[PDB]
Amino acid sequence: MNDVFTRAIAQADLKGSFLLESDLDKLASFAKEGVKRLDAVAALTNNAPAIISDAAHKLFAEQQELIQPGGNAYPHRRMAACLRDMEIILRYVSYALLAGDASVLDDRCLNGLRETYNALGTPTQSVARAVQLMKDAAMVHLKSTANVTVGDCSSLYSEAATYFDKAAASIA
Amino acid sequence: MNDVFTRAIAQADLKGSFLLESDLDKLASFAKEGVKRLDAVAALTNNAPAIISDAAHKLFAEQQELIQPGGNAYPHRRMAACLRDMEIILRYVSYALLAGDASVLDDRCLNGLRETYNALGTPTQSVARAVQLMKDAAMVHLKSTANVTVGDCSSLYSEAATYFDKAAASIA
Amino acid sequence: MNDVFTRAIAQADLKGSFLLESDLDKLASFAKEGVKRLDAVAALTNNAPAIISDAAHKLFAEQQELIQPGGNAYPHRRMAACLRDMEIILRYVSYALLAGDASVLDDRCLNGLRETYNALGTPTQSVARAVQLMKDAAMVHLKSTANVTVGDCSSLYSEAATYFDKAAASIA
Amino acid sequence: MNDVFTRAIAQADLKGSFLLESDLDKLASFAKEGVKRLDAVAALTNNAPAIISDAAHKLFAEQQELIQPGGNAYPHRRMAACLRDMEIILRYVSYALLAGDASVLDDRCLNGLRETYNALGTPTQSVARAVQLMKDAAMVHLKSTANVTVGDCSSLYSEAATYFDKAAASIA
Amino acid sequence: MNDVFTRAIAQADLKGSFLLESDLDKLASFAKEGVKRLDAVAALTNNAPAIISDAAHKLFAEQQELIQPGGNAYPHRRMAACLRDMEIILRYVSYALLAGDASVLDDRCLNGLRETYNALGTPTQSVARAVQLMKDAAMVHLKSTANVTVGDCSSLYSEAATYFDKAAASIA
Amino acid sequence: INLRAPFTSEEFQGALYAIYRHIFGNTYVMESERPTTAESQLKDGRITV
Amino acid sequence: SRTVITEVIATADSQGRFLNSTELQAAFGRFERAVPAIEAARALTKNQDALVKGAVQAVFKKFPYVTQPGEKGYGDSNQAKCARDIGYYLRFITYSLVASGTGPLDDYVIAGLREVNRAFNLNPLWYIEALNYIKGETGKLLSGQSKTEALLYIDHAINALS
Amino acid sequence: SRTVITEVIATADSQGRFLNSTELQAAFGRFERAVPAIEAARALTKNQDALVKGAVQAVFKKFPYVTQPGEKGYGDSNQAKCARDIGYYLRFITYSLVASGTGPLDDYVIAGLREVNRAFNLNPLWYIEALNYIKGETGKLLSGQSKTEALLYIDHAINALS
Amino acid sequence: SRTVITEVIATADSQGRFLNSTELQAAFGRFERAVPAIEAARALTKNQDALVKGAVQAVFKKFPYVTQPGEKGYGDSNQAKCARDIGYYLRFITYSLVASGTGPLDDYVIAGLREVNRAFNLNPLWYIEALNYIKGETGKLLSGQSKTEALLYIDHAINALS
Amino acid sequence: SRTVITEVIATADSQGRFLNSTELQAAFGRFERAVPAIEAARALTKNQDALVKGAVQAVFKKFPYVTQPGEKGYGDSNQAKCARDIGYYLRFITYSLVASGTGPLDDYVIAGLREVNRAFNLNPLWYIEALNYIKGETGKLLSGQSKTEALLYIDHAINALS
Ligand SMILES: CCC1=C(C)/C(=C/C2=NC(=C\c3[nH]c(/C=C4\NC(=O)[C@H](C)[C@H]4CC)c(C)c3CCC(=O)O)/C(CCC(=O)O)=C2C)NC1=O
Ligand SMILES: CCC1=C(C)/C(=C/C2=NC(=C\c3[nH]c(/C=C4\NC(=O)[C@H](C)[C@H]4CC)c(C)c3CCC(=O)O)/C(CCC(=O)O)=C2C)NC1=O
Ligand SMILES: CCC1=C(C)/C(=C/C2=NC(=C\c3[nH]c(/C=C4\NC(=O)[C@H](C)[C@H]4CC)c(C)c3CCC(=O)O)/C(CCC(=O)O)=C2C)NC1=O
Ligand SMILES: CCC1=C(C)/C(=C/C2=NC(=C\c3[nH]c(/C=C4\NC(=O)[C@H](C)[C@H]4CC)c(C)c3CCC(=O)O)/C(CCC(=O)O)=C2C)NC1=O
Ligand SMILES: CCC1=C(C)/C(=C/C2=NC(=C\c3[nH]c(/C=C4\NC(=O)[C@H](C)[C@H]4CC)c(C)c3CCC(=O)O)/C(CCC(=O)O)=C2C)NC1=O
Ligand SMILES: CCC1=C(C)/C(=C/C2=NC(=C\c3[nH]c(/C=C4\NC(=O)[C@H](C)[C@H]4CC)c(C)c3CCC(=O)O)/C(CCC(=O)O)=C2C)NC1=O
Ligand SMILES: CCC1=C(C)/C(=C/C2=NC(=C\c3[nH]c(/C=C4\NC(=O)[C@H](C)[C@H]4CC)c(C)c3CCC(=O)O)/C(CCC(=O)O)=C2C)NC1=O
Ligand SMILES: CCC1=C(C)/C(=C/C2=NC(=C\c3[nH]c(/C=C4\NC(=O)[C@H](C)[C@H]4CC)c(C)c3CCC(=O)O)/C(CCC(=O)O)=C2C)NC1=O
Ligand SMILES: CCC1=C(C)/C(=C/C2=NC(=C\c3[nH]c(/C=C4\NC(=O)[C@H](C)[C@H]4CC)c(C)c3CCC(=O)O)/C(CCC(=O)O)=C2C)NC1=O
Ligand SMILES: CCC1=C(C)/C(=C/C2=NC(=C\c3[nH]c(/C=C4\NC(=O)[C@H](C)[C@H]4CC)c(C)c3CCC(=O)O)/C(CCC(=O)O)=C2C)NC1=O
Ligand SMILES: CCC1=C(C)/C(=C/C2=NC(=C\c3[nH]c(/C=C4\NC(=O)[C@H](C)[C@H]4CC)c(C)c3CCC(=O)O)/C(CCC(=O)O)=C2C)NC1=O
């Protein structure tokens, strides 16, 4: 598994060289902004039930066919699997936010997920829609000014958005 | 796994036949010449560290790209795995030499080795070169006339060369 | 782990003869009261959460010390272990009641149950009291004849009381 | 696991000295009668089920109560277990015979046997009698001078008797 | 396994009360000097092979019967086991030092160590002496003021000595 | 490979080799990654295979 | 109880090694974050009764039917158990603040929570609304990193109950 | 097949180690014992027809009843299968003699023997009688050690049948 | 590689749960310790050539015999490989300083170190002497927390060799 | 210890079967080879003093720097320990010869060799040189197969060292 530091180190090892001063400056800036990054990760973790609940409500309001008999979330076991999956993907998005790298998200969550869903009959368009709705709910929670020090966290917002978008693209 | 005797027996069973007199003569010759085979196997076993060290030195003298950053024996772990591989292959060649049959190389040492190396990304030409170097360094210890009664062991040398070449050709 | 029919068979084979006609009549009577016993077991099974809830309420009403910090039913982990033990005891009582045997009860848990409670430090007399409260709730459920046809069930009630007493006595 | 050679070496290493010329003479003697020992082991192996059957027939013709219901070997599976135990102990006696040492029987067969039979209620006296009956049958089969070169082998008979008697003593 | 904070919370909870002003004072005092304790743990960790080498040299100078044949450190296997045990005990003392509590030293390392040594014939006095010698070397290494900011650490020296003496008393 | 409570050094080391070859999927485990404390507990009899 | 230091030692022990820079830096972060956390614990401890009575009143406001006769919250004993439960929750939140981990929360609350609430028909939403009241009050009883710590632990409790 | 050389190699390979003096001495013992075993196999091969015919007739002598119509030993096909089976047993015994191990008997006759005999209602006592026969004549066909190896293998087959 | 962040994330992942306050505190300590660690890494990067030359000369001073004919220090290739190895250790030490964890050293150097030094007959004491020299020199290149970070990683490598 | 007989019986026990031809032949090879092994044991035991002194001198010739002060071999105590260790190796080689197995060497020397040598900073090349000297002097006063056995066991020890 990787973070920004391990990724840079691996690239330098491939080059066979020391980390350059520009790379050290990039990593210094990363570690400097790490406190904001921890705030964002805590925003994801503390508000996760709300994010999943809002995404699920909007998703099943949009696609009533998913909760009807013959739908892919019809019985309780299928709905529970749906909600479980949503929580798992959000949790690996939070891990990738903390790491600053998407390696854990790719290796663990999105590894063979498209083929799993294809073999299950799970509509991958609807999974991607669910991931988008979680992205929206999360973006509302990470932008919250309450209980933090006001400051510029647009880089974190964009990075979290990239993680969500990469999840939804890998699935669909 | 098979030795020479069980291989003859298996080839005789497909015919529904008892072992012939010529087959029994061949097996009696094999056993009667077995003390030299034991000496050769002891020669491979007792000089195994020397064989592997010599072959490794030559291999990384010819091919510096294996031990450069980015090379496939670069870090200590990859080099350690390389040395394990050489020791394993030499050990199995000694097994085959004792058995008089290559069945233990086919069934065990080379059973999925090419696929292993292909999936890992290991250059199988360099592996075959390592096996060739081990063959070159093992012929010396086989042909060493000290501490043993003198005699004609050209057949044993040829058989050992066929085992080494079988390993090399199954790798590449 | 043997049933009343198997107890009769075991005794018969210990004495080495066939089953006696009086024994055969006793087992026929057991089969005749089998439907009695199945209604009793259904009463135990369907009302099990209610029985355990009532028994726990009464037990922690009459023994407040278990509730307090430092008590044995404190915190949630120990309260859950308490309720789980009550569930296991009631389950075993229903098993024995269906079986018609009490050895199936003593061989099932009661061998290790007491000294497990001792190694933990759990007061065995409080477990006996909990079993007795479960007995009272179980009785007030088996006597309940709503939506069940009416008739004498003195044997079932006596045997259920015997099994509850056996649990509460082997624990304490 | 130990044999005569390893036992002598262990004693010497406890003293911290080399093996003595008397010890070397004794071990050379032991290995000179090795073919005698191989014939004894073959007599035990080739005739093992005949030995077990004869011992079982004699034991049940003597200790009649085991056959009868309520007896130790009465149930058909318990007869199976009886014969299995006899076969196992004969196998380990032949092991100790080939090894030339006794304690290999004591290690993996006899240390955990007495309390096992006591917990199971098996009379150790009957087991010891069964071992002695196998001793007599195997003594008859070992003394058989046909099929083998005639020679004095009283020491082998003494050693086999010591192993059988030690097994019986450990069981009972 | 506990630390000082968890032990304090446990004592508070057994009474059922919030943590007192004195308790929070003591815990904040522990926390403010915790960075001082990190250097003690680092001194233990960074010099562990040197500490164990000095302790082993002095122990086998004092008690030569151990490394003599017949002693319990005589073969390579037993000497390696002895050095491994020194490694283990020093590791657990370092864990106790970082945690501020000896719970890890007693729960995991020393639960049945005396019984193990007694059943194996290890002289527990010798192991306690090895622990004392390790303590002496550890004190020599903790008190080095090179590469650290000079300050009072008699509390850490005392606490480390207590952990070492507790391990020694547990073994002996 | 069956490893009882009492065993010799050869039996122990061979059982360790078999265990690491199967449980780690024929993947190389270097000398630094090998668990010494767990091997010791298994050597004493505190844990079974 | 699983805290920063306990997790440190558990990892090192499981890998059979000494504590090195990774673990020592994690412990360093624990020690640096100690003082706002103990500050929050002190602030929540001084305000025992205000928080607990306010939380009980908040529960009885959000679920008015509970206080009516024939319901779980009717009776003086039930009210006292309201106060006792909210005080237990606050106590373990302060313990977690002290220990720099959810260890006290997991051991004393989160483990066995759902089965106990099922067996006694205690609605987790009551406690969730009480904890939300505690959060709102802590928002002003504390400031800065102490407030962040307290909120993190209260939200862990909530998400365990939700 | 389980032979001396094969078990040597397999035991060394299971521990991931080279062939040492112990295993080389075992191999030496095999290579020395080859001469008696191979010429015993030679003798058994040269006399296969007489041995098999005598074995079939010995089975018919110790079990007269099977010869009568309506049961196993009746008919040309059944007796041809008797001869074929006894030839199979002799063939794999000679195989084991040559290979210096019970491997061929273990892998070709003994693995799956009871299930097959049970399914086809074949008495192991017939084959035991045939092998006791073959044992008796291999006594006089062979002298010295060769007799010894031949009889170890024949008795191994008999023990497998019982 | 095993860093503070990576162990945090792997712990939460193996437990199937979100990152809680304890792990955020560990991460916070990492992000703080980064400033001295990156400063130490930059200082060691500037002076890598001087450090390598000094370490090689220290190795030759403490083991004067290796440079003698017939031993591993004789020839220009062997001493070039000396300089290469010291460069490797220094580079991976700076990697572990940047990464805030022993991961680069464990993965790239320590994993396989013993087998390799044993196969090629490299004495670990040579590298221990070189690393002790580098330790002494960085004692003069750095100060404060940079010094202790660099020293901790250096003697992690040293204990790995011994 | 791992001898021919012990490996035989262990393999037979692991399958839960009796001892048969494929095991008796291995034991036969052991009994055949016993005579050269015991003769080699007598030869190595009679000449043990000269062998040990010559081996120590060979070590000090090949590694002269060891004798210089501040090195491992300086001092009479260290050199006495050298003589003691070479005597240990020779004694266990004699044991292994007698038992016809690597069992004595494995149990008393090989098991734990690397860790013990690393902890006390003992160079395996010293012992390799001493065993090479013992091999050379075993080239004399041993003839034929006994010399072969002694050389095989010494080469086993050397291979374990390196
Ligand atoms: C086949 C088995 C199955 C069951 C049993 C089932 C129950 C169920 N009911 C739901 C909606 C709902 N169900 C209720 C419950 C009712 N509404 C109120 O009028 C009453 C008080 C109460 C009935 C006693 C409510 C309030 C919702 C809306 C919750 C929301 O906003 O998502 C949902 C969420 C998805 C949706 O329909 O929007 C499920 C999964 N679903 C299943 O697939
Ligand atoms: C217990 C675990 C832990 C956490 C959670 C933590 C977060 C943390 N956030 C901080 C401030 C901050 N936090 C943020 C981030 C917020 N501001 C923006 O509006 C966004 C809405 C949002 C991020 C998405 C910002 C911008 C600062 C100011 C510090 C700076 O800009 O350098 C600080 C520095 C002290 C302060 O200025 O208040 C810390 C230590 N540290 C820890 O050890
Ligand atoms: C990335 C981690 C890594 C390390 C650390 C590493 C060390 C390393 N150094 C080597 C060469 C060497 N290294 C040395 C050691 C130095 N030379 C002498 O001048 C000094 C006395 C001595 C000072 C320490 C020697 C003598 C060799 C030659 C090896 C040989 O020919 O046998 C080799 C053998 C392969 C080769 O031919 O290059 C390795 C594996 N390799 C790695 O992949
Ligand atoms: C049947 C017995 C057997 C064999 C033969 C065997 C070979 C083998 N070699 C492996 C790795 C390896 N093998 C090599 C060796 C190559 N490097 C090149 O420079 C050399 C030319 C060449 C060796 C001479 C290397 C470097 C690796 C590690 C690959 C990596 O770490 O990515 C692996 C994967 C295990 C792992 O990577 O941890 C196997 C299975 N395994 C077995 O159980
Ligand atoms: C413990 C393990 C063990 C070993 C190693 C062993 C070897 C062994 N080597 C022998 C002689 C011999 N050894 C050899 C082999 C050598 N001749 C050439 O120099 C080759 C370079 C080399 C083989 C590649 C030869 C040709 C003989 C002559 C005996 C014969 O050919 O029959 C003999 C028979 C003695 C004789 O009649 O001369 C044995 C038993 N025996 C054992 O029990
Ligand atoms: C699937 C489980 C199951 C149930 C639910 C069940 C009910 C049941 N009870 C029966 C007889 C009966 N069972 C009872 C038992 C009752 N006496 C008291 O009122 C108690 C409330 C209760 C016992 C605790 C009685 C009184 C009768 C009828 C009298 C008789 O024929 O003996 C019968 C046989 C009558 C028929 O089918 O025509 C059934 C099916 N039987 C079952 O196998
Ligand atoms: C393949 C397995 C194998 C076996 C079975 C074996 C036994 C064996 N028994 C032998 C003769 C013998 N066999 C015995 C056995 C005794 N004789 C008495 O009648 C007793 C009943 C019996 C006690 C067990 C004796 C005493 C000798 C002669 C010993 C000698 O050669 O000095 C011989 C030497 C025959 C010769 O070459 O002239 C061998 C090799 N060796 C093997 O490698
Ligand atoms: C929970 C942490 C833990 C501890 C503490 C531990 C110690 C430990 N030491 C043991 C044996 C041993 N311990 C020693 C050490 C002593 N012998 C004396 O000679 C010396 C004075 C002294 C060395 C300083 C020795 C030599 C043995 C082997 C005894 C034997 O094989 O008979 C054993 C049992 C067998 C083994 O694995 O070797 C354990 C479990 N193992 C663990 O997993
Ligand atoms: C990577 C892991 C890590 C370590 C190792 C670490 C150590 C560390 N030691 C420090 C000072 C110190 N270091 C010590 C050490 C003591 N001084 C005495 O000479 C004793 C011999 C010795 C006991 C070992 C002391 C007493 C202080 C002063 C602490 C204070 O001012 O409160 C400081 C603060 C420097 C400052 O701001 O003034 C740190 C961060 N921090 C970390 O994150
Ligand atoms: C250490 C952690 C811990 C907690 C938190 C805990 C909660 C708890 N509260 C209980 C009683 C209770 N607690 C309440 C609380 C309710 N009252 C209503 O007014 C409110 C809506 C609501 C408060 C928010 C009620 C109604 C009961 C009675 C439940 C019953 O007996 O059925 C009980 C059952 C004890 C008994 O029956 O004697 C438990 C286990 N127990 C623990 O060991
Ligand atoms: C029975 C198997 C066995 C062996 C083989 C063995 C070797 C051995 N030799 C030792 C001492 C030693 N042995 C030597 C040997 C050196 N002296 C120099 O003249 C030579 C160059 C060189 C020998 C070739 C030295 C220097 C020491 C002292 C190590 C020290 O304590 O610093 C020690 C440590 C003694 C202690 O506990 O203090 C061991 C374990 N021990 C055993 O139980």
Side-chain angles (χ1 to χ4, degrees), chain G residues 13 17 23 25 39 78 83 97 99 104 116 138-139 146 157-159:
Chain G
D13 195 338
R17 64 190 172 71
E23 301 86 12
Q25 290 179 42
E39 166 177 21
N78 291 352
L97 275 151
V116 168
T138 315
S146 53
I158 283 180
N159 289 356

Side-chain angles (χ1 to χ4, degrees), chain A residues 57 67 74-76 79:
Chain A
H57 284 56
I67 46 178
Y74 162 59
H76 290 170
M79 181 74 108

Side-chain angles (χ1 to χ4, degrees), chain B residues 10-157:
Chain B
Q11 293 314 311
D13 189 8
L14 285 187
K15 297 188 298 229
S17 302
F18 284 72
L19 272 163
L20 293 177
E21 301 302 326
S22 77
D23 285 334
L24 290 179
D25 290 350
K26 263 172 302 205
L27 298 179
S29 303
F30 184 97
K32 184 272 291 173
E33 282 296 34
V35 293
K36 308 151 71 169
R37 181 169 304 272
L38 289 187
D39 265 327
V41 171
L44 280 190
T45 298
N46 296 323
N47 303 114
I51 288 164
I52 298 157
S53 163
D54 194 4
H57 281 86
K58 311 219 167 164
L59 176 64
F60 303 129
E62 313 167 2
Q63 300 184 348
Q64 313 284 310
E65 50 88 20
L66 285 179
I67 51 170
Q68 297 294 321
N72 190 359
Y74 162 45
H76 274 307
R77 202 268 181 193
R78 275 198 193 73
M79 168 67 74
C82 182
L83 299 161
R84 297 272 283 271
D85 274 14
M86 307 181 86
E87 171 285 346
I88 280 167
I89 293 157
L90 178 69
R91 172 159 65 79
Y92 270 97
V93 172
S94 84
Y95 291 162
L97 195 55
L98 187 61
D101 201 24
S103 174
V104 68
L105 264 47
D106 277 327
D107 283 5
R108 270 147 192 248
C109 195
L110 318 163
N111 192 2
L113 200 45
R114 198 198 302 251
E115 293 82 3
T116 284
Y117 283 137
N118 287 342
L120 278 159
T122 289
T124 59
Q125 304 323 308
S126 298
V127 187
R129 184 73 191 118
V131 185
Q132 293 154 20
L133 293 175
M134 279 195 300
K135 189 192 55 174
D136 296 358
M139 280 312 120
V140 176
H141 300 289
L142 284 194
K143 292 173 173 167
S144 159
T145 199
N147 314 299
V148 288
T149 300
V150 189
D152 181 21
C153 297
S154 293
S155 70
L156 291 180
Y157 309 151

